[PDB]
Design an enzyme around this catalytic site. Structure first.
Site, PDB file in Angstrom:
ATOM      1  N   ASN A   1       0.873  -1.174   0.000  1.00  0.00           N
ATOM      2  CA  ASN A   1       0.000   0.000   0.000  1.00  0.00           C
ATOM      3  C   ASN A   1       0.914   1.230   0.000  1.00  0.00           C
ATOM      4  OD1 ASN A   1      -2.530   1.190   2.389  1.00  0.00           O
ATOM      5  ND2 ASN A   1      -2.261   1.663   0.198  1.00  0.00           N
TER       6      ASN A   1
ATOM      7  N   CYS B   1      -6.475   6.058   7.470  1.00  0.00           N
ATOM      8  CA  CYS B   1      -5.700   5.097   6.698  1.00  0.00           C
ATOM      9  C   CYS B   1      -4.880   4.238   7.650  1.00  0.00           C
ATOM     10  CB  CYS B   1      -4.795   5.803   5.664  1.00  0.00           C
ATOM     11  SG  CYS B   1      -3.301   6.617   6.298  1.00  0.00           S
ATOM     12  N   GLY B   2      -4.840   2.933   7.379  1.00  0.00           N
ATOM     13  CA  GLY B   2      -4.158   2.007   8.260  1.00  0.00           C
ATOM     14  C   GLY B   2      -2.673   1.925   7.991  1.00  0.00           C
TER      15      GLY B   2
ATOM     16  N   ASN C   1     -14.689   2.556   9.649  1.00  0.00           N
ATOM     17  CA  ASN C   1     -15.306   2.220   8.380  1.00  0.00           C
ATOM     18  C   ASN C   1     -16.026   0.870   8.488  1.00  0.00           C
ATOM     19  OD1 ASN C   1     -12.742   1.038   8.729  1.00  0.00           O
ATOM     20  ND2 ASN C   1     -12.038   1.458   6.639  1.00  0.00           N
TER      21      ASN C   1
ATOM     22  N   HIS D   1     -17.171  -3.004   7.555  1.00  0.00           N
ATOM     23  CA  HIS D   1     -16.504  -4.162   6.975  1.00  0.00           C
ATOM     24  C   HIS D   1     -17.427  -5.365   6.959  1.00  0.00           C
ATOM     25  CE1 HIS D   1     -12.362  -2.468   6.882  1.00  0.00           C
ATOM     26  NE2 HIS D   1     -12.856  -1.713   7.850  1.00  0.00           N
TER      27      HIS D   1
ATOM     28  N   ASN E   1     -16.165  -2.151   3.076  1.00  0.00           N
ATOM     29  CA  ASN E   1     -15.039  -2.883   2.517  1.00  0.00           C
ATOM     30  C   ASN E   1     -15.262  -4.376   2.691  1.00  0.00           C
ATOM     31  OD1 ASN E   1     -13.125  -0.418   2.090  1.00  0.00           O
ATOM     32  ND2 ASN E   1     -13.964  -0.236   4.175  1.00  0.00           N
TER      33      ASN E   1
ATOM     34  N   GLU F   1     -11.907  -2.850  -1.565  1.00  0.00           N
ATOM     35  CA  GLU F   1     -12.076  -1.623  -0.792  1.00  0.00           C
ATOM     36  C   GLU F   1     -13.021  -0.648  -1.488  1.00  0.00           C
ATOM     37  OE1 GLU F   1      -8.166   0.063  -0.141  1.00  0.00           O
ATOM     38  OE2 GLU F   1      -7.278  -1.934  -0.036  1.00  0.00           O
ATOM     39  N   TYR F   2     -13.743   0.117  -0.678  1.00  0.00           N
ATOM     40  CA  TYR F   2     -14.594   1.156  -1.233  1.00  0.00           C
ATOM     41  C   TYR F   2     -13.744   2.188  -1.972  1.00  0.00           C
ATOM     42  CZ  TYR F   2     -17.155   5.465  -1.455  1.00  0.00           C
ATOM     43  OH  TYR F   2     -17.718   6.647  -1.882  1.00  0.00           O
TER      44      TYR F   2
ATOM     45  N   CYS G   1      -4.843  -3.777   2.865  1.00  0.00           N
ATOM     46  CA  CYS G   1      -5.859  -2.947   3.509  1.00  0.00           C
ATOM     47  C   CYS G   1      -5.784  -3.208   5.015  1.00  0.00           C
ATOM     48  CB  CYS G   1      -7.251  -3.268   2.960  1.00  0.00           C
ATOM     49  SG  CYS G   1      -8.596  -2.384   3.803  1.00  0.00           S
ATOM     50  N   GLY G   2      -5.146  -2.293   5.750  1.00  0.00           N
ATOM     51  CA  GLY G   2      -4.942  -2.503   7.177  1.00  0.00           C
ATOM     52  C   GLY G   2      -6.239  -2.555   7.956  1.00  0.00           C
ATOM     53  N   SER G   3      -7.142  -1.603   7.701  1.00  0.00           N
ATOM     54  CA  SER G   3      -8.448  -1.631   8.355  1.00  0.00           C
ATOM     55  C   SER G   3      -9.146  -2.971   8.127  1.00  0.00           C
ATOM     56  CB  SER G   3      -9.293  -0.454   7.856  1.00  0.00           C
ATOM     57  OG  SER G   3      -9.801  -0.696   6.556  1.00  0.00           O
ATOM     58  N   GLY G   4      -9.130  -3.468   6.881  1.00  0.00           N
ATOM     59  CA  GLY G   4      -9.745  -4.750   6.592  1.00  0.00           C
ATOM     60  C   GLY G   4      -9.071  -5.904   7.302  1.00  0.00           C
TER      61      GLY G   4
END
Lengths: 285, 279
Positions: free
Chosen positions: A17, A78-79, A164, A166, A197, A215-216, A224-227
């Site tokens: 990323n 952002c992750g 966000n 998921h 996401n 991801e959206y 995708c860290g959040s994911g």
């Protein structure tokens, strides 16, 4: 040492990323035009996100950062980027010590320096209640929900908010999943906000999970860290993996720790310096 | 050595990392691959290395590596970017000079700061020069049923590299990747043929998409644009001066006579200067 007409930058990535990092202290923000140029992989620099670093806003943080997507609009979190800002801050003398805080657009996050390349960041506390995701058409919290996306697409998924939304779908093999197609279907289902996401997760063991995320906006990226945090929390909430677990993404491997259901998810991973750059004729777009 | 200075350029969206190799080794395959990686490296279609000239005429030579580290015999957009680089570095003084590519020597006219006309090569249509196989004694528009069920009518020409040029009604919806690969695997050509999909808007204007050897489609293929123009000129469908519209920009192609080089006019841009950190 800054040549007029040029914009210094640092190219970095966190598990693939990738970011253009600007030092914005004592100057303007980049316009959307400039962000779009920076993110253009063929005619500009090329990156998933532009990160701009400034003086801290909070009492405790050592630096603040803002975020722009490849179309020039601001982004709220952002992750992977946070690790790169942290590494950049350490390199610039902003952040000394094993532990410090960073202001993101949406919060303040504690960072632990594990070694020169490895940073652990508190992201957010997972929210599972259908009411807080929101998960529409569902009232009781459940480990797994079931979606009829038309004949031939029946999907069993978990749901969780990390700031966000998921959806997390367990699969036989991630390299394998209809990530773009099912991810778009879930996004258009109306079961979530259109911003959801969609992760496709394969449990190799209680210690190790393989993941791809639709991801959206961007669609799929290398990481995708959040994911990853969402997939880990979901699988922990259902007893499938330990409370420390590696999440293997296309671009790299993260380590997710969630010590307590009331605590923040912690995301450990690499930050990488790729090259330093000077973008020419920065006023001419 | 430790860190590595480079220049990022593009020619109509066909983008390059330019190294100064005048007194240093060539980039390794491994370095080329890291350089070309768009997410964990710099990101580019080709790596270009500037060297001292070989021919009596030229002011500079350049070599070409693909994103997998292997060398490449020529590049149309790259030459314009090497020309701009050479002017900026003081190698080339006035409005014309010559450059050695891996496969020839090319006259450059500097039309303005960002616009360069470069002589690519003399077109060769002889089936034995392409080489065309199965045909190899035949010069006309060709038709062939490929191994994948598609029937194609195509012209053939060599610009140094091989080209198949297919006329279509709409470049936007043409099967560039599918038919481009079919043609490369056909055995009618070396696997190295570039496959163009061209719509003639007027005698002055042609829209083009090109499936390239190795890379597949990019935002611009200069040699493909020259090949499509020369084919359509020999077929009498366009003028000897013609615009070729590609995804990343527009080129102006001129072929004054059948023994002349095809001349390719288009943009060259500096994007940023960089220092690759290896580590």
């Amino acid at each position: 040492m800054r040549t007029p007409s040029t914009l210094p930058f640092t190219k970095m990535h966190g598990a693939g990323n990738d970011f253009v990092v600007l030092d914005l202290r004592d100057g303007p923000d980049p316009s959307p035009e400039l962000c779009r140029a920076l993110a253009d992989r063929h005619k500009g620099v090329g990156c998933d996100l532009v990160l701009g670093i400034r003086e801290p806003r909070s009492a405790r943080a050592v630096a603040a950062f803002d975020i722009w997507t490849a179309d020039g609009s601001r982004s709220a979190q952002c992750g992977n980027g946070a690790r790169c800002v942290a590494a950049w801050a350490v390199r610039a003398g902003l952040a000394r010590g094993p532990r410090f805080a960073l202001d993101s657009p949406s919060g303040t996050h504690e960072v632990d320096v594990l070694d020169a390349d490895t940073f652990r960041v508190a992201l957010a506390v997972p929210r599972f209640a259908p009411e807080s995701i929101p998960l529409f058409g569902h009232d009781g919290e459940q480990d797994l929900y079931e979606a009829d996306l038309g004949d031939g697409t029946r999907v069993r998924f978990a749901a969780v908010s990390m700031g966000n939304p998921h959806a997390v779908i367990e699969v036989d093999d991630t390299a394998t999943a209809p990530v773009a197609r099912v991810g778009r279907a879930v996004q258009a289902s109306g079961l979530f906000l259109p911003t959801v996401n969609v992760g496709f997760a394969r449990v190799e063991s209680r210690d190790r999970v393989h993941l791809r995320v639709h991801e959206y906006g961007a669609g799929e990226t290398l990481a995708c860290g959040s994911g990853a945090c969402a997939a880990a929390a979901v699988l922990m909430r259902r007893g499938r993996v330990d409370r420390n677990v590696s999440v293997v993404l296309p671009g790299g491997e993260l380590r997710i720790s969630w010590p307590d259901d009331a605590a923040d998810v912690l995301m450990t991973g690499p930050a990488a310096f790729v090259y330093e750059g000077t973008f020419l004729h920065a006023s001419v777009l």
